[PDB]
Structure formats: C-alpha cells, structure tokens
Design a protein around this nucleic acid. Sequence first.
DNA 1: CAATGAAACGGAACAGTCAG
DNA 2: CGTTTCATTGTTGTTCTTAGTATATA
DNA 3: TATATACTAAGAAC
Lengths: 121, 125
Amino acid sequence: YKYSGRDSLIFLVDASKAMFESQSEDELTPFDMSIQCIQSVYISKIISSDRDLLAVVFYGTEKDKNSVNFKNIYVLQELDNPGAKRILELDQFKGQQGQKRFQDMMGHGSDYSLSEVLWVC
Amino acid sequence: PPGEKPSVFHTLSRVGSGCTMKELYDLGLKLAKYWKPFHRKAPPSSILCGTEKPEVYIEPCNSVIVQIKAAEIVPSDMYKTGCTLRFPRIEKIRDDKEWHECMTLDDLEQLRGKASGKLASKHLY
DNA sequence: CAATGAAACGGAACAGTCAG
DNA sequence: CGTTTCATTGTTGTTCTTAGTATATA
DNA sequence: TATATACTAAGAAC
C-alpha cells in the first residue's frame, strides 16, 4: 500500500459496570485485562512502528467528552503518534486503586449504544 | 430596552463559506434539534423575511452567533435590511457570544454609513 | 511530510420565461 | 469571483570517516 | 619503553 500512509489502531473498551468489577475469581479482571492488553500493545508499538497512530476511547461511561458531545463516550487519548505521555495515562488506571480512580473520574458505566460508538470512532 | 433581549430579527445576508467541514458538522449536530420547517404562508414572528426565504428556520434563542467578514455593504432587494454583504464568509463561530449579543440595525446603519458602504476604512501600519 | 496548486462552490446579480 | 480542499513534489537512510581505544611488538 | 598497528566504535555525510 501507499508507503507514506500509516497504520492506525483505535482502542475501545466496554466501560459498563458489566466487566468493571466482574472478577468471578480473584486472579484476573477484564478491565485489568483489557488495559493490560492495551498497555502492552501500545508500548510494543512505541519501539516497533513509532510512525503509526493509536487511540484509546471508552464507551458507556458517565462523564462525557468527544468530538460531537454525545452520551456515554470518552475519548481518553486521541489519535496521534505514540508517546510516553500516554503510557503514563494508561498506567494511571492499572490497579484496584486505579480502577477506583477510573470509576470515580468517568463513571460506573451507564447505558450505551454501539451504533453511536461506531459513529464516533 | 435596557435589560431586555431582542425579539425581532431582520435578515441581512446568506453565508455558507469560511468553516471547515468538521466545524460545519459540529454546528449541524448542535442545531439539529432546533430547526423548524419554514412556511411562507405562516412565517415566524421573531424572524421576518424579505424576498429570500430559508428552507428551515431556528428560533433566535437556540441559534449561534457567527463572525462575518465581507467586502462591503451593498443595496439589496432580497433582504429586509435594504442591503446585503458582498463576498461574505464566516471567520469564526462565536461560541463565546450569546444569541442576544447580535448587533442591531443601528450598528448596521453605522457601519454602512461610516465609509459609503465600504467596511474597510482603517489604514495599515 | 508537507507546501503548492484546482477545483470545486458559493453566492450576486441579471432577464427572460412561465404561470397565473 | 473568492474560499476551501486535495494531490502532488521534496523527502532520506546508509555508507563511509574519523574517531577512539585497543593491544602487542620491536 | 616506545611505536604502530587493530579494532571497534563511534560520527556525518550524502
């Protein structure tokens, strides 16, 4: 494909109360799993293809901001070249204390609609 | 009157240039729930119209102020103000201004009479 | 990776036509 | 007629240069 | 003890 073009991967996690504290057992957590996956892939992409684009955007949240001021959508970090200033932002949420921060800053997880999630991403 | 907000508006010109399409999409999403179909046989009282009629109208309290830069003010038989704008385009979407902060016919007349309709009357230094 | 170019559009004004 | 948008040409990564430090050899 | 000979490892140039 066109060389000057670049790969772009956007990240989008269910922010409802569904998997925020599912934790059937005490050995994993889907949010602690999804955020771990995002952090790992994003740090790998740092070194691998630093020219590319990544973005993380949560849906179903209670606080709101996006390009179109919709409901229950949070664009955590926009599409831009990867960098540490966002490694830290993602890392801020890794942890039980971190999930406490996430819930009391954006929300428990309200109602949502993946139509509007696809529209906004 | 002092302390009160305007209730009757006089159309001046049509503008459709100066905004990036992302800004236009944002403004359309913002205003979508306020547009009402325009009836020539039943026009709104807050918005009088000249010969030019819009396809849809919006009540002034729900609208947005736009900053317009145009070459000059020229006579027109299509707008009630007796005049329109030559080469008009939107410079900024004035989200920092309220709807009632729109100028008045007195301001329009002052601008028209300042330089014989020309809106450029200041030297470059 | 972007400055430079176009092309595409947005009215502005005119008149002839058609309806009525 | 003016404004805006898009697409394309300049863009570079690599090789070589010098460096620096390395040591043993005479 | 002196001398250079070797190397790698830098660099920047294009």
